Each structure stands twice: as structure tokens, then as C-alpha cells.
Amino acid sequence: EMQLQQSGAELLRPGTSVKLSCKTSGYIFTSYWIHWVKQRSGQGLEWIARIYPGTGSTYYNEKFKGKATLTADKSSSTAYMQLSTLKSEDSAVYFCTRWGFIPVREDYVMDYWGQGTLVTVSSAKTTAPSVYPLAPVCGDTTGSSVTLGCLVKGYFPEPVTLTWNSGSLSSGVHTFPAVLQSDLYTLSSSVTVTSSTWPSQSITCNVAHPASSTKVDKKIEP
């Protein structure tokens, strides 16, 4: 199993720098080129650079010379990308990939990608979210089924982790993308169950915000 695992989300102050890591396993690290790709506002991909771990040989997209520096630790099968003097345009998701093009063969093997690392360039303070349970009254859909909710608001930065009944409840769950407004995010999730389950069986909203070490569980009481 070829696996590329990238480091966690980063909140970075303007003008400073970060080092992102891409840990690989399952193949001979020194024999394949590792490329780094950038994605802004979803549809908006850009090729940054590539490195051949076996030799340390690198090639950069002109735009990123001076912005990105690629290195690779053979002893740990880990590739790194340092980004210097961060600015607004640097807030993006960065992917590492064992692309697979084999120059000598003029052909390709399978491409494997890391999960991506989100970088947020901001001077804003880390703020813990407030979690509110949404028991219906009108948003009960009447009989048959009922939908409950969970409102997570006033946090910074992304991400926040939301599950229902510790992940034991995933069917009929809709988690909405966070929206930033006034330097703080708001996220919400709904879960629809049968009139029979709730309130008979307890439904709990689990929320985690790594940045502020927050972890809360809100039970939806009638």
C-alpha cells in the first residue's frame, strides 16, 4: 500500500514561514519524483515544483522560486516544502504526490496523493467555538421522521470536527461547510431520524476544535 500522509492544518502569521511535511510509505522513496501542487478556492490548481529524493535534484515553477524550498529526508522517507514570507495568496491547500511519470520509460505508473494540508495566513486570534443544540418544535417534520441540529459558531480558525453519537450515526447527516463572517466561522449539521428513535434514544453532537484544544458534546434535549 503506497501511502502519502501530510501534516495538519496550519494557521500562520503574515510574513512568517512554515514547513509542510509529506510522509511516504509502501514504495522505494528514492526512486520516484515527488511533486507539490497548490489549490486555491477549489477549482484553481497550480504546479509548484518536483524533487527526486534519490539525488536531491529539484525543479521549480518560476513563480515559486524564493517562495518554496523542497527537501527530502531519505532516512525517514519524508518530503518537505518550506514556504517563506507568507502572504494572502499563500492561503491554500497544498498536495504532495508521487505523480508516477517515469522519464526513462516515457510512461507512467499510478499516481498517489497525500490528503492535502490547508494553510491559513492570518494575524487573527485562535477562538473556541460555542456549540448549541437544535431541538425542533416546527423543524420536527411532524411525525414519521424528525430532524435535529447542531450549531457551532464563533470559532477561528478552521477546522472543527463534528460527529453524531461518536460517529455511530452517519446516515441522514448533513454537515454544512463553514462560513466566515466577521473574522469567525459558523458551521451547522442536521440529522434526520424516525419519530420512534428521538427522544426515546439520546442523540449527541460531538465537536472538536484542535486549534483551541476544545472538545464538547451536546445532547439534544427536547
Binding site: 490548481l45 497550480e46 499516481d111 492535502g116
Partner: protein, 219 residues
Amino acid sequence: DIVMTQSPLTLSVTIGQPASISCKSSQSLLYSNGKTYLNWLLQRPGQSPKRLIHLVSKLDSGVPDRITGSGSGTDFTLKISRVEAADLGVYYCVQGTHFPYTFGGGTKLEILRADAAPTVSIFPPSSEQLTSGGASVVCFLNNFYPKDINVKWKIDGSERQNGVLNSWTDQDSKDSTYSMSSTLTLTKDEYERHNSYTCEATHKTSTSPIVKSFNRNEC
């Protein structure tokens, strides 16, 4: 740098039907060695990109042969002979003939399904929130299709435009529908001054607005 132009930006196709996406380049992608380094990638919702085709028409291992690629020079096309639910996502063509490698803007493939009327739920502020001096009224509009919808909030008959936060999910892989959440936030004091809170939606599935409301009072 080479500019890659993709069209259409979005395509809505029914399962079982064919789809074709175009990609045009500002310079010929034919390399001096006679090979053409044009690739096609698919980025599924919440996933990393994945390559489908390399060298214009060659399929990567494990990719269904329902997908085919063709073209040359500055003109290329990706074709899906018969669309399946798993094809939902954004497709990108990316050239590697000229340095630096450049991507097209992407084409979002949406699964066209039968209209579905929204299931709307409304929630008054939680006691916990009111304690903090804030008041948010939430409205969930779940599983509708088409994605086009307009929601307005009305308090005591008058439209409220300030303090509204909307969020939509991407198209669901399970049923091909969309969901939306609308949160209206006020101060606890103002919330306790009004009676009726209405979430009103405008959607293809109805000639009149879809309404959901509650009246706050005592007892």
C-alpha cells in the same frame, strides 16, 4: 506559460447518458520527441485529485474504460460513454509538454435527476445561546433538486436581510440532491421583541413560496 481553456464550466448529465469535456491550449502540446503530454484528472468531492488519462488517450490502471480521451495539437476531449453516479466531481486537463505544467480551470460534472422538493426544518434559539445574549434562528432546507433556490427571512411580516448566513452542501453521491442551511442571528433583546419568524424559500418545485415558521410567546 501555456493557458489551458476548458468548457463547459458545468455539465448536468443523467446517469446512463454520455458526456464530453473540451480542453484547448494556447500552444501546441506536441513535444519535440513526438509525444503529447496531456493528462486528465478527476477531483471527487472532498478528495485529492486523481489521474484518469495520460498521453492524451491512455487510461491509467484501474480507471473504467467508459472514459476515453482524444485530440492533438491544441484541441483535446475527454468523453464518458455512459455516466455513473461515481463520476460526480471536477475534471481538469493539465499539460506537461511545456514548463511549467499548467492546469485548465476545471469542469464540474453534475448528475441530473428528477426535481425534489425541499424538506424544511426551523429551530428557535437554544436556551444556552440566549443566556449569552445572542439569538440565532436556523432553517435547514434538505434534499432538493435543482440546486437553484432562494431563501428569505421574514420577521413579523417584514423581510430581514441583515445578519443572515447561508451554506450549501455539494451534490450528494447517495441521492444526487443538495441541502442548504440558513442562520439568522440577532441579539437576545431584539429576538424577544418580535413574534413570528419565517423562513421562506423559492424553488422550481412550487408556484408559491415554501414556508416554515414559528411564533414565540410564553407557556
